Design a protein around this nucleic acid. Structure first.
Ligand code: MG
Ligand code: MG
Ligand code: MG
Ligand code: MG
Ligand code: MG
Ligand code: MG
Ligand code: MG
Ligand code: MG
Ligand code: MG
Ligand code: MG
Ligand code: ZN
Lengths: 71, 129, 101, 132, 217, 83, 221, 25
RNA sequence: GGUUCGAAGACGAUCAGAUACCGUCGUAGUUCCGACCAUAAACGAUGCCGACUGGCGAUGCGGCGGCGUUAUUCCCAUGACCCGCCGGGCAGCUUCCGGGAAACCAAAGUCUUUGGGUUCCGGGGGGAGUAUGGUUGCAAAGCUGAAACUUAAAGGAAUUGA
């Protein structure tokens, strides 16, 4: 803490609110932008219909075809 | 500007005790400073001192022993009940055998162990050990 | 990494020092940062001094000097070998090289 | 490039301190001295040791050599160190004294010694080097 | 001294001090030595109070006597002015001399051949002998040093104010330091002058040696 | 350090500087303990009595080791009061 | 095999003339031979290798790999040592680190929490040690708490005889080198801390170098 | 790609975007 | 108003190319007056106010004191040197004060022995000082300022090599 007066509780409290929004994990849980970008909508599981069967390459050091499904 | 004279007095004593001197000159004087050192006096941490009387805020010359580890001030002067006193001394004292929290009550400026002995809360001023 | 305590110059409490011009190139350098030579030499150098001395119409003519002051940017100063880099602790001394000859 | 290595210099410096009296000034005699007094396993460094020993002789003859101590030369070092004069350099009938220490002595119980002579202090406090 | 008349400095010692110029210090004065100084000249040289020189000299003598074994009191002088005085001080008192170059590690490197661990160092100058004083910081032993008006008092325990750069003054200070340790240990009586001449402790540079050799011969 | 019954449970009692009254540590290899000999009043010769002073390494490195010795000496009469 | 002392303090110890290394701690003497320690604590000293750390330097042809060993030793009441030795082979690094660990053993002050009944068990007060970025704090704890700490400062404490203590670590504690010897820093200064039970003026004891000068002069010169 | 020239590129691109925007507004 | 210099441009070189570095010429500008703009590695990459904690030699201003030189001359006193002391100021050297990841810093110390007062401000790297909205400006642009998405590193001080 920088300011240390007895009557500075409004100063200290309202400074936490501003600086908590620069916390990345706080930023996404308390905004609706992250929740609406989630395909699940905030659920742990979801059901869907298989559209096609696809395989992706892996990455630079590895080399394998990753069996995936587009749902 | 100068805001808390007791904060300056104890910081000055702590630097000169840390460097091994024998006497310290405390530039501003007040009843709070004189009453605070007399508490440190009664427990043998400092020697006897002397206040110089110019017609302004006087000076003080304090004889030092080698027994003081740290003296400090708590800002702001929080109010402390008897319920909060065990938690405060848990935070800012080294052990449970020695060390003292000086806190002013309506009964006067006086340290924590006996402030509990006459069942009075107060406002915390500082600590020494 | 802070290489030099004073930042290669002599500006302490100014904020701005006027710039000068290098002599080798035309690089614009602050006056306090530039490396300054002050060379004082005779007109005739060392081997013609006898030739003009015998050809002079005067007796015991003291040959004139040539006072010109030089300014160098850091680039020209290094490339002309008027100053050279030194070891890290040797950078700290600032007495000029010996002036016997 | 005729620089003598350590194994020649070290051997010669040991030989000179232990057999100074027997050694000479010519290369050929003390070459025989070195051969019989130390077991040197070949001729070439026997010659190189003997050659350095001869070179060390001339240095020793002129004066002392730091790394080696022949018995004679320090015997006169301790004779030089033991030397003492006949009258003391600390015994004078006039001790030159400036004014200020006369007051320093006056504060001491030595207010006036027998043989102190006061001088006039130098006027002009010009005792610093010019700054440049 | 303890204000004892037997230990008080006398007239025949003061003249020896004044002849050697021990009172004369230098042009500089560090804050650690400012209470060993009387005052300053118009010449720029400081006067060393001889009262405090003597008392500090006697205090150093007390510490040397307390060492029962004289062999583990080490004496060092790197500059050539005090090498002869060190060779003579050890002869009279029985100390172990170290004259010349001090090889770093004599006090801390037990594997070395010249590993010696004394109980007391007497040093001719803290500035020229910075190395032995630093070594004394690694093993617990006090240090005694002759200190001029400018020498720093790092790691020094009994600073004896004197003129530790003059040829005579260094010899005189080592001579009567040896005298007082002998008088206090009982080897010598205080009623007679000591037979050892002070000039036996002065350093004699090569130039003046041949001058007296041809003069004597 | 005693417990409730009064027994000394401390493993040893460490030394403590005579000039600054701080504890000399078990690895303080810059600390000293200097003995100063005692003379008798009439002859001025070594009796066999000492005065012992301890100095922590902080004071020696500070350069105040001799001044501390000087005052502790005149505190016990070894050095003349006038000085 | 037989130990031939080359130090002055070593000769006295072998002659069975110093009652305990606790006596030589009182005078802060430098123990420079490894055999004074195991003479006094040899049966009770346990050693444990904290880890093996392979530092390496890159030369013209490849890398030069040297193994560095951290070894912590100490009897389980009042003594702890920590030594570090780097050598080209792991076996010699361990042997050389134990020798360095033995020379650095420091005694441990242990006190009480609350009331002072029984043997001391905890740290006497709050002590802090530092090296590098590691800050380590030891807080006194009630009896039976145990040691609550990271694994590597815990084993130093169990061989200190401290059987309960609260800790707190700041900095890059994953650097086991600093984090080991920051605990050992806090343990060291538990005698350096002046407590109101140490206000009695010290009665000076006459030193072993001065006490035993006569046997010292005789036995070896 | 030093930041000074990157910023200059960004300014030119932004100016083009703006012009294309009031062309449509 | 336009001497010099010189964005753009023109030509001559060089070059594999050379819309550049080199050379010659040269526009806007560079100068002044009156209005806008509000950004710089606008840096000490280091908020302000206050207290305390080592020395040493300097330098600038003012003040105080002191041997002695040198002018006015006709001595007082003012100037110029010299020797110190005090208060602010720009810095410097040294240091196991202490701190720091270190480089280093008498502050970047008096911090797990954590609280002198108070302001601004950072929360892995990118996207991005970008989109949009608002506001200021003649314009150039300034201020305020996201997200989707992407990625296990990006980075600081020091060490050994090449
Ligand atoms: Mg660079
Ligand atoms: Mg600027
Ligand atoms: Mg072209
Ligand atoms: Mg042109
Ligand atoms: Mg900006
Ligand atoms: Mg900035
Ligand atoms: Mg904090
Ligand atoms: Mg971020
Ligand atoms: Mg990866
Ligand atoms: Mg950067
Ligand atoms: Zn240039």
């Amino acid at each position: 803490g920088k300011c240390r007066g007895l009557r500075t509780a409004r100063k200290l409290r309202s400074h936490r609110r501003d600086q908590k929004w620069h916390d990345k994990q706080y930023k996404k849980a308390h905004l609706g932008t992250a929740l609406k970008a989630n395909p699940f909508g905030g659920a742990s599981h979801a059901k869907g219909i298989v559209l096609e069967k696809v395989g992706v390459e892996a990455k630079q050091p590895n080399s394998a075809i990753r069996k995936c499904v587009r749902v | 500007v100068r805001m808390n004279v007791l904060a300056d007095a104890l910081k000055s004593i702590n630097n000169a005790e840390k460097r091994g001197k024998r006497q310290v000159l405390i530039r501003p004087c007040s009843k709070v400073i004189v009453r605070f050192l007399t508490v440190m006096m009664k427990h043998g941490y400092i020697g006897e001192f002397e206040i110089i009387d110019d017609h302004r805020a006087g000076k003080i010359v304090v004889n030092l022993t080698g027994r003081l580890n740290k003296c400090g001030v708590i800002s702001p002067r929080f109010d402390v009940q008897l319920k909060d006193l065990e938690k405060w001394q848990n935070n800012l004292l080294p052990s449970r055998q020695f060390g003292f929290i000086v806190l002013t009550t309506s009964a006067g400026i006086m340290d924590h162990e006996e402030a509990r002995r006459k069942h009075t809360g107060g406002k915390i001023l500082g600590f020494f050990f | 990494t802070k290489k030099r305590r004073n930042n290669g110059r002599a500006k302490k409490g100014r904020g701005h020092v006027q710039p000068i011009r290098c002599t080798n190139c035309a690089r614009c350098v602050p006056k306090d940062k530039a490396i300054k030579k002050f060379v004082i030499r005779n007109i005739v150098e060392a081997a013609a001094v006898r030739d003009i001395s015998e050809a002079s119409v005067f007796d015991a003519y003291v040959l004139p000097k040539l006072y010109v002051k030089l300014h160098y940017c850091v680039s020209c100063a290094i490339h002309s070998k008027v100053v050279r880099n030194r070891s890290r602790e040797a950078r700290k001394d600032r007495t000029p090289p010996p002036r016997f000859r | 490039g005729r620089v003598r290595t350590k194994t020649v210099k070290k051997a010669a410096r040991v030989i000179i301190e232990k057999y100074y009296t027997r050694l000479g000034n010519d290369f050929h005699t003390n070459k025989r001295v070195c051969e019989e007094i130390a077991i040197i396993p070949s001729k070439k460094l026997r010659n190189k040791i003997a050659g350095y020993v001869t070179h060390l002789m001339k240095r020793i003859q002129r004066g002392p050599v730091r790394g080696i101590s022949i018995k004679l030369q320090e015997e006169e070092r301790e004779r030089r160190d033991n030397y003492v004069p006949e009258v003391s350099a600390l015994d004078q009938e006039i001790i030159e004294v400036d004014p200020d220490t006369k007051e320093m002595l006056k504060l001491l119980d030595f207010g006036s010694l027998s043989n102190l002579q006061v001088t006039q202090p130098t006027v002009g406090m010009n005792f610093k080097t010019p700054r440049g | 001294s303890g204000a004892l008349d037997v230990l008080q400095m006398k007239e025949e010692d003061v003249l020896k001090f004044l002849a050697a110029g021990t009172h004369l210090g230098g042009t500089n004065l560090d804050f650690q030595m400012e209470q060993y100084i009387y005052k300053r000249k118009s010449d720029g040289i400081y006067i060393i109070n001889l009262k405090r020189t003597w008392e500090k000299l006697l205090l150093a003598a007390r510490a040397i006597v307390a060492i029962e074994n004289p062999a583990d009191v080490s004496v060092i002088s790197s500059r050539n002015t005090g090498q002869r005085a060190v060779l003579k001080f050890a002869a009279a008192t029985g100390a172990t001399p170290i004259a010349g170059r001090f090889t770093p590690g004599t006090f801390t490197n037990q594997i070395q051949t010249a590993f010696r661990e004394p109980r007391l160092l007497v040093v001719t100058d803290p500035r020229a002998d910075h190395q032995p004083l630093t070594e004394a910081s690694y093993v617990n032993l006090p240090t005694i040093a002759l200190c001029n008006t400018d020498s720093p008092l790092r790691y020094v325990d009994i600073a004896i104010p004197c003129n530790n750069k003059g040829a005579h003054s260094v010899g005189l200070m080592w001579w009567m330091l040896a005298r007082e340790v002998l008088r206090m240990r009982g080897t010598i009586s205080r009623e007679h002058p000591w037979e050892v001449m002070p000039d036996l402790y002065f350093y004699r540079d090569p130039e003046e040696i041949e001058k007296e050799e041809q003069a004597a011969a | 350090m005693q417990n409730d019954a009064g027994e000394f449970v401390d493993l040893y009692v460490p030394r403590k500087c005579s000039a600054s009254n701080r504890i000399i540590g078990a690895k303080d290899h810059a600390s000293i303990q200097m003995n100063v000999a005692e003379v008798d009043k009439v002859t001025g010769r070594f009796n066999g009595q000492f005065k012992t002073y301890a100095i922590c390494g902080a004071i020696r490195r500070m350069g105040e080791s001799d001044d501390s010795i000087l005052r502790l000496a005149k505190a016990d009469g070894i050095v003349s009061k006038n000085f | 095999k037989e130990w031939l002392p080359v130090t002055k303090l070593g000769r006295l110890v072998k002659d069975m003339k110093i009652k305990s290394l606790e006596e030589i701690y009182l005078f802060s003497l430098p123990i420079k031979e490894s055999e004074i320690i195991d003479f006094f604590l040899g049966a009770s000293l346990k050693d444990e290798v904290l880890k093996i750390m392979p530092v390496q330097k890159q030369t013209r042809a490849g890398q030069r790999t040297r193994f560095k060993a951290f070894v912590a030793i100490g009897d389980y009441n009042g003594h702890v040592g920590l030594g570090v030795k780097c050598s080209k082979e792991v076996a010699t690094a361990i042997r050389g680190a134990i020798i360095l660990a033995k020379l650095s053993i420091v005694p441990v002050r242990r006190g009480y929490w609350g009331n002072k009944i029984g043997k001391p068990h905890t740290v006497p007060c709050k002590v802090t040690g530092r090296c590098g970025s590691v800050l380590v704090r030891l807080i006194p704890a009630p009896r039976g708490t145990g040691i609550v700490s990271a694994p590597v400062p815990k084993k130093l404490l169990m061989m200190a005889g401290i059987d309960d203590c609260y800790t707190s670590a700041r900095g890059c504690t994953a650097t086991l080198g600093n984090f080991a010897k920051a605990t050992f820093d806090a343990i060291s200064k538990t005698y350096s801390y002046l407590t109101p039970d140490l206000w009695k003026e010290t009665v000076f004891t006459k030193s072993p170098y001065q006490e035993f000068t006569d046997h010292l002069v005789k036995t070896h010169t | 790609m030093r930041a000074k020239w990157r910023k200059k590129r960004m300014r030119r691109l932004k100016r083009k975007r703006r012009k294309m925007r009031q062309r449509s507004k």
